[PDB]
Amino acid sequence: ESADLRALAKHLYDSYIKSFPLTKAKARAILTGKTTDKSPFVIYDMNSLMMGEDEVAIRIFQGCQFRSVEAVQEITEYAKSIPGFVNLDLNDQVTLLKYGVHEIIYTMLASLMNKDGVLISEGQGFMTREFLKSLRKPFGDFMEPKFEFAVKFNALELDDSDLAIFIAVIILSGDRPGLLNVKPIEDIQDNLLQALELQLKLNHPESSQLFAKLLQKMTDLRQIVTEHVQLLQVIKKTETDMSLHPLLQEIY
Amino acid sequence: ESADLRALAKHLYDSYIKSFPLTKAKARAILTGKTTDKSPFVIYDMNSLMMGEDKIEVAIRIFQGCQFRSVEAVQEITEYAKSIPGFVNLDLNDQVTLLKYGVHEIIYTMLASLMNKDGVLISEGQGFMTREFLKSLRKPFGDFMEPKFEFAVKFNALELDDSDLAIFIAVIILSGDRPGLLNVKPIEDIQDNLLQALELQLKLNHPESSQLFAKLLQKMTDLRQIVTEHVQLLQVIKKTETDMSLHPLLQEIYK
Ligand SMILES: O=C(O)[C@@H](Oc1cccc(C(F)(F)F)c1)c1ccc(Cl)cc1
Fold this sequence. Notes:
Two copies of one chain form a homodimer. By secondary structure, the first copy, chain A, is mainly α. Chain A has one domain (1-252): Orthogonal Bundle (Retinoid X Receptor). In chain A, 58% of the residues lie in helices and 5% in strands. Chain A contains twelve helices and four strands. Chain A has helices at residues 4-19, 24-28, 46-49, 56-79, 90-110, 129-133, 144-154, 160-171, 182-203, 210-215, 217-231, 246-251, and strands at residues 41-43, 113-114, 117-120, 125-128. In chain A, helix 1 crosses helix 9 and helix 5 (90-110) packs across helix 11. Chain A is globular. In chain A, 31% of the residues are buried. Chains A and B meet through helix 9, helix 10 and helix 11 of A and helix 9 and helix 10 of B. The site of ligand MSZ has 10 residues of chain B, from helix 3, strand 3 and strand 4. Ligand MSZ binds at residues 62, 65-66, 68-69, 120, 122-123, 127, 129 of chain B.
């Protein structure tokens, strides 16, 4: 009877694996687990940064939201793969992606983090956490709360099959402000929540109550997304430039 | 293994009954029509403040009352915590930061029971203050209760009764994702069990309400934001008015 739950599960797993080049399996088999393919370049301080492409803190935060925008296209193509999603009202598809993209970015940035730093480029760099903390004062405490979140989150040791379904759950919320038709949204989340329970039950047979521990991390995602959006304040009081980046501004 | 948690469910229900004099069941019989003796005196403007204070600045005297209700609630929350199995076997310092900010995440869960879309029970349930008398208040004060209402009406949609809430209240306390917690893991093995109790209890009490377990856990997000806002505006009310005094218990919970 619960066959579609196992089915939807690898439906989502397959889209996940198409939509996202760097899988968690791949990322962690490069970070901690001695990969071998070709150790990524490491950035530990101010001069290893200089000549990695081979001011500092501004262009590093910029670079981050450059990639955040690539990500959104990856996530948007995923959402559209979730059964029921495109059949929603089209405004609602947009409200769901608008309000849920940050949460998914920070869930998946966990996959590329360990306690000592984060994979850069796509697994071809690694920027140490200790270097990031030694950035200027607007930027020295931005990436820190995400590491703090990641180590907790990875302790759950989910893989990509788990994350595939979890990501779909975040999108199909039902409490985003400005939704015109919540029921098809909440009825889909229901089927997703149920496939995720199953998946966690059989892929993590003796990690009891992982479902519950995972749902309550959605609490800490939103605190993170909140404090992140609030940090975007510096933008107003920064070394705001002159005309050299117009188009780019509204690109972001 | 099943009646494990139903004996745990039972246990907590009892303490809850013993610890909190105004349950949801009682409050829901007052806010409706189950009354000839239980009907509240309704306050909605300021000469309902008036004669209202026979049947035992205004915006201030109300706020303090609300802040004093919270003290009572801290006291009863603490008594209920001690009954949660294993809770009292934890590091003295840990217990204190388990019942720190969690005291408010719970207060607003139980405030929801005294609320409908149009107001909140007051004084023993004797009273009932409307949402709009509150919103229509002064300086920052007219801001305070409104988001509790927003949460209260969407929370109350879940249709939880006391037996459900008892366990969920427990799960809130025994979290273990709180600043200062020396020895975490014993906390989240306790909580691990509560969630088992909650899971079984919800499926059994609300068999038709699928994924209520999931919907309910999610609401903890809304709770933290509610405390955030409350704490937040509870800094302004300290510059605008340096005359109001804050209760000793509320005093050091607030950091
Ligand atoms: O009537 C009450 O129970 C309290 O006054 C209140 C007045 C308005 C709102 C509230 C609250 F329940 F929303 F917090 C309490 C109250 C409690 C104790 C003393 Cl001493 C004074 C006022």
